[model samples]
Target: GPHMGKHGRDDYDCTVIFRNNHAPERQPIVVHTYYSRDLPIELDGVRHTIQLSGCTPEQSQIPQGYSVEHMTYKNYLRQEILNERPFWP
Candidate 1:
């Protein structure tokens, strides 16, 4: 069960969301990122990237699987409610 996928190690997919720093007026953009882990849980660089870009991480969809390992990250995106189309908070 440890070595399951092609990589021979369990992996997880993490989706991150960031605000449109340059044009907050606009919506969100998609950013897909990937990472590998041996011990598990390591996702700081992502926030930094977004921070460096002047945007802020709003939320994340971190998956640990069914008692699984969530390594690395993939995806840079964000969104919220609506008012004809509302924004994230």
Candidate 2:
């Protein structure tokens, strides 16, 4: 099996790749940016603090059991693929 992780940068591209899973997530990861076309944008006026977080909508679709506020956003602090090695596409 391949591993699963989110890998990418904000300036050029931001993407979450699945390793060992043999398939990509069904929907695009949630992307948020602080600027556009050289214009300025701010999230509490902090740069580098801006980034995209990836999570599947399906994971939070359970009615009554899940809350939107509870699903705000979370950084990918760490990701690992167990029992497998990485490969290039």
Candidate 3:
């Protein structure tokens, strides 16, 4: 398939999601982050990519229950370009 949209025509659209499932009070733990290759999930027509950078929740939506963080697909791609890990600012 040809590149018809933001992602490859074969590439499924997915929104990045990260959630601080634990109570906010709990301190963050050291863990590996999700990379673009493995991030896109739950195809919904948006090339959302969720990376595990201790953002608690790298990317989230309106639903609430825990801490959330976010970044656009382009920003996520930047990481690939420079090989950077934006582990929460």
Give the whole-model CA lDDT for all candidates, comma-separated: 0.27, 0.24, 0.37
RMSD of each: 14.9, 13.3, 12.5
- Which one wins on TM-score? 3
In each prediction, how many residue pairs overlap at the backbone (N, C-alpha, C within less than 3 A)?
A: 6, 5, 3
TM-scores for all candidates: the values are: 0.23, 0.16, 0.26
lDDT string for model 3 (1-89, tens) is: 11222342222222233344645554322122333433432222344444443233444532344333344444445644567554555
Error of 3 at 47 (Å): 18
Clashing pairs in 1: 17-77, 31-76, 32-75, 33-75, 82-86, 83-86
lDDT of 1 by residue, 1-89 (tens): 11222231223344233334445464332232233211222232232222111222222333222122221232212222222344545
Task: Please give the lDDT score for candidate 1.
Answer: 0.27
**Candidate 2 structure quality by residue, lDDT tens digits, 3-88:** 22233443422222212122233322223222221211111222212123332222222223222111211232222222233543
Pick the winner on lDDT between candidates 1 and 3.
Answer: 3
How accurate locally is residue 35 in candidate 1, as Cα lDDT from 0 to 100?
33
Please give the lDDT score for candidate 3: 0.37
Residue pairs whose backbone atoms clash in candidate 3 = 18-57, 33-52, 34-52
